[PDB]
């Protein structure tokens, strides 16, 4: 696909990177590697999963999830599969803000994994290492 995923989230994934990194700890072997399909699943990387919700509005920072933001950070590019995607999704909620966070995440990479991955490299490619 010549795709180009834009949005809210695209345009602001440096900053946003930048301080939910700074936040928990999270390093790029990590991310990048998250993007290219490796399992990370360290505390850590939870909570950045979780820190860039709060950010983008679709999760309290106490680990509560709103749908409403989280159709709206879907890329208009895939509006319709992602919005598929986030109304399967939408009751996950687990025992902690950050692992409800990441297990929000794993719903949606289980509802579609390919455009799962498309977002994931999307994101990743706009912030660097």
């Given at each position: 696909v010549n795709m180009k995923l834009t949005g809210r989230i695209m345009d602001a994934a440096k900053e946003v990177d930048h301080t939910c990194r700074s936040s928990t700890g999270v390093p790029r072997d990590m991310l990048h590697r998250y993007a290219e399909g490796q399992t990370v699943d360290d505390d850590d990387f939870k909570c950045y999963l979780k820190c860039i919700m709060v950010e983008f509005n679709s999760?309290?920072?106490?680990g509560v999830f709103v749908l409403e933001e989280e159709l709206e950070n879907v890329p208009p590019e895939i509006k319709e599969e992602g919005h598929r995607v986030v109304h399967s999704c939408k009751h996950i909620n687990h025992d902690e803000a950050c692992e409800t966070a990441y297990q929000i995440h794993q719903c949606y990479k289980q509802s579609d994994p390919e455009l799962y991955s498309l977002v994931v490299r999307a994101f990743d490619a706009t912030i660097g290492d």
């Amino acid at each position: 696909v010549n795709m180009k995923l834009t949005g809210r989230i695209m345009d602001a994934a440096k900053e946003v990177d930048h301080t939910c990194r700074s936040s928990t700890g999270v390093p790029r072997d990590m991310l990048h590697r998250y993007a290219e399909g490796q399992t990370v699943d360290d505390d850590d990387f939870k909570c950045y999963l979780k820190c860039i919700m709060v950010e983008f509005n679709s999760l309290s920072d106490d680990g509560v999830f709103v749908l409403e933001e989280e159709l709206e950070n879907v890329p208009p590019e895939i509006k319709e599969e992602g919005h598929r995607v986030v109304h399967s999704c939408k009751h996950i909620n687990h025992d902690e803000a950050c692992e409800t966070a990441y297990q929000i995440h794993q719903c949606y990479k289980q509802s579609d994994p390919e455009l799962y991955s498309l977002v994931v490299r999307a994101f990743d490619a706009t912030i660097g290492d």
